[PDB]
Design a protein around this ligand. Sequence first.
Ligand SMILES: O=C(O)C[C@H](NC(=O)c1ncnc2[nH]ccc12)c1ccccn1
Length: 167
Amino acid sequence: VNSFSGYLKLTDNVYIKNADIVEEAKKVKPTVVVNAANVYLKHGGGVAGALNKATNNAMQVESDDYIATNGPLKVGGSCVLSGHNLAKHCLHVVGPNVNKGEDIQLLKSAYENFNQHEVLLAPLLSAGIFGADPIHSLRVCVDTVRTNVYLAVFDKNLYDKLVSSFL
Ligand SMILES: O=C(O)C[C@H](NC(=O)c1ncnc2[nH]ccc12)c1ccccn1
């Protein structure tokens, strides 16, 4: 038993809600919140900009030190950093950004990072301003992640569309 509330059950291990991931994180304080990052960990907009703003820019400061030491992530890759005031840990996961011309096939690799964590609060990878088909992303999530994932979808119209089209 865990502390997530009002999530619609999609499968044996995937739950979904129409909610702001920042607000869910501040309420639940999950072990792991997933950030929809880029390879430079430049947290400008979307999930990343919103999470970082909620940490008062501490996420960005930590991320800049990470990049200075380690260099950029790979598309499809991830790193574990602090969750600051939002969670114990933040798993920064890089899904392909279609608006940058990145390989959509890399979405499955991106979701595989979730399997290293027993429970996660996450956004829908590569959706929104990342430019991929969100129905496809939810499908890849359900077909790739085996650990317990709680998906927080910001856009109300998007959430309704995702639920009504889920096979
Ligand atoms: O779920 C959605 O609608 C799409 C989702 N976006 C957000 O969660 C989001 N975007 C902007 N400002 C925000 N403030 C609080 C939440 C939030 C998303 C997923 C992957 C990549 C990019 N974007």
